[PDB]
Design a binder for this molecule. Structure first.
Ligand SMILES: [Mg+2]
Ligand SMILES: [Zn+2]
Ligand SMILES: [Zn+2]
Lengths: 331, 330
């Protein structure tokens, strides 16, 4: 009965010089302060994001896990590490390096720290090879971004990657990233508050409405980050549109709500009513506790929203433990 | 009583009538030899397959009688906005459309109420048309949060909302659909994803910019389709405000405290969604709207609210009471 957090991130000890070998403007690296408790993710000479010790230091992290009552945490790259816009070979070299960094991090305590891998998703052949390599080496699955520029999950290359993972029993977590919106959505974290949930909804609907679930093997274990975005709340609208418009129906033979048995979401939705609605839509077997640890807005009491919800005790148990045990094959 | 405050009409134009505005930018109705179908036209190409309830108020009252709908507030189909055109030519278009709206309502003004469109690309002309249309019988204004290509949040929009608040002019907001850029090409994805996100963005932009601090409390503003995803995603917005400096810069209160400054319609297509919407907004701030007579408008008007587990007073407020106060309907 381990308490499992399946949505969290790490960042490796990459120096500026190391990152420069790949891309001096675009490869992220880690700057750590003198006292060593805080740092920043850097991109070239630019500060990308201020971070703290739990992000890079697994010993420090275990202490916080202890204080949170988290037994096992599944962790994966900070999305800035993805490098989906890079030349494909360079991106594959980068992924292998990051994925090796991830295993080194988990090596501190592999019973309590699990890792998922990144892949050079812009090149289907290399992405499949890295997925298989990383898993064989000890990763429990892969984390990918939810789109590749104007390519959403219905794109043939992304469907093909998902099918490879299905065929090799490799679980996937889909994380929103590279948020839509252009220029008008800059201030007050609007990309995070508006664009991110729409990104995740768009990913899920792209799979459903394109008929991708009719082609991708049922074996696929796939989870959408941050509660599935706005998906669960806007599902009624989707069903209504499918019922009454032929162009919504053309590639999708069953009502869209029926395909919730083909994917999972994490529980990171911040509000009790929102979580209750999410569970009623997805089912108790399909929502996994995930916190977004250690980022500033990743719920400071891990599992606290779930435990303080109205959900049944067995639902709470599945969400906190059972579902992720099965999803990631954590014994 | 039963008031449906979200519905659309289209006037009976002609090609030549609209052609003197624009040949391939100005919309018009084409009803062929078999006058029970019709379609909205732009140039000579079909913009949208249309129904005989969109034009023809006699046809509307019968359908309104067939559903338990006593009073319906109706307004421009988004196609007729004309925000892309020259500000003076769009001002002339708005008037004709707003006149068409009144002659539509004139069929039974006690049962058909209308809201007006404005040349929002020009602040002065929009404020002037809002006042003119309201004095002529319109009960308020429907705006899009766009200019057929707009940067979303500006002093322009705020200034227009202030003019309307001061003159007791209620506002209904319809969202832009272009957030997805070159994505969302299929399966009505802009309607299913970009639009609810846009509505959320419109609301949050007012909140996070400190608009509701400068806008008189007298403003009656309503957002379409439940406020999009706003109510569901508010928990994350509150959490972000609570823990991040930049989110608090121009907004002194938690964003969820500003729910009493706007209304939403009830068009969320799902029991659980409605229950959450009413929990967030309050029973006084949700109004029944159907999006009639569009194919994606709700089937049994009021059905979702009428079959809910909400209280009797709450149900009465949503179906009739709130709209009566918002629009000043007897
Ligand atoms: Mg494409
Ligand atoms: Zn995350
Ligand atoms: Zn509408």
């Amino acid at each position: 009965k381990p308490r499992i957090d399946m949505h969290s991130h790490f960042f490796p000890r990459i120096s500026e010089q190391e990152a420069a070998k790949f891309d001096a403007n675009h490869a992220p690296w880690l700057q750590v302060s003198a006292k060593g408790d805080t740092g920043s993710i850097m991109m070239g000479k630019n500060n990308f994001r201020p971070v703290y010790q739990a992000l890079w230091d697994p010993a420090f992290r275990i202490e916080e896990m202890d204080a949170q009552g988290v037994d096992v945490q599944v962790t994966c790259a900070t999305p800035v590490m993805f490098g989906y816009t890079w030349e494909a070979n360079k991106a594959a070299q980068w992924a292998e390096r990051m994925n090796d960094f991830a295993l080194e991090f988990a090596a501190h305590n592999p019973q309590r720290i699990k890792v998922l891998a990144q892949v050079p998703l812009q090149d289907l052949d290399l992405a499949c090879k890295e997925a298989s390599r990383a898993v064989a080496a000890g990763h429990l699955g892969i984390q990918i971004g939810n789109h590749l520029g104007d390519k959403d999950l219905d794109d043939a290359t992304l469907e093909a990657f998902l099918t490879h993972c299905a065929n090799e029993d490799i679980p996937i977590l889909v994380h929103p990233w590279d948020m839509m919106g252009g220029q008008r959505m800059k201030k007050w974290m609007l990309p995070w508050l508006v664009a991110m949930p729409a990104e995740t909804q768009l990913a899920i609907l792209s799979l459903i409405l394109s008929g991708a679930f009719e082609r991708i093997p049922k074996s696929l274990k796939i989870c959408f980050g941050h509660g599935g975005g706005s998906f669960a709340f806007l599902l009624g609208r989707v069903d209504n549109a499918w019922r009454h418009r032929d162009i919504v129906r053309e590639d999708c033979p069953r009502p869209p709500s029926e395909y919730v048995d083909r994917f999972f979401v994490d529980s990171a939705v911040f509000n009790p009513g929102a979580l209750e609605l999410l569970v009623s839509v997805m089912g108790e077997d399909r929502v996994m506790l995930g916190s977004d640890y250690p980022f500033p807005l990743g719920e400071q009491k891990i599992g606290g929203l779930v435990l303080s919800s109205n959900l049944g005790e067995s639902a709470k148990d599945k969400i906190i433990s059972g579902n992720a045990s099965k999803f990631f094959n954590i014994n």
